Amino acid sequence: KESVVFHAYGGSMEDEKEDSKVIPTECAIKVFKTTLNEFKNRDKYIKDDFRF
């Protein structure tokens, strides 16, 4: 309802950086829905958080 999960195959980065994160072969991309008016009830768990 709020996000869509897509399975995809990740690429192999040719940059030999020592601090480069290892990309998994299979990845999941979650894209949150931004055009749906059903998210008006989610403010209860965000307004109570001191970090944001």
Binding site: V5, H7, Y9, E26, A28, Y45
Partner: protein, 52 residues
């Protein structure tokens, strides 16, 4: 192989496997409450996946 892990509700586990899954869920909840200092607040059968 681009197949997502099935949910805990849709998994047909045996009695020992169900007990092991319940113990793992309890341990994960204890680790989240104590070490991660966070409450999931949406923990259910559809929020848990069984893999290996």
């Amino acid at each position: 192989d681009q197949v997502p892990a099935p949910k805990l509700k849709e998994v047909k586990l045996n009695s020992e496997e169900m007990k092991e899954a319940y113990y793992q869920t309890l341990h994960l909840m204890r680790q989240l409450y104590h070490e991660c200092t966070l409450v999931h607040a949406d923990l259910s059968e559809y929020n848990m996946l069984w893999h290996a």
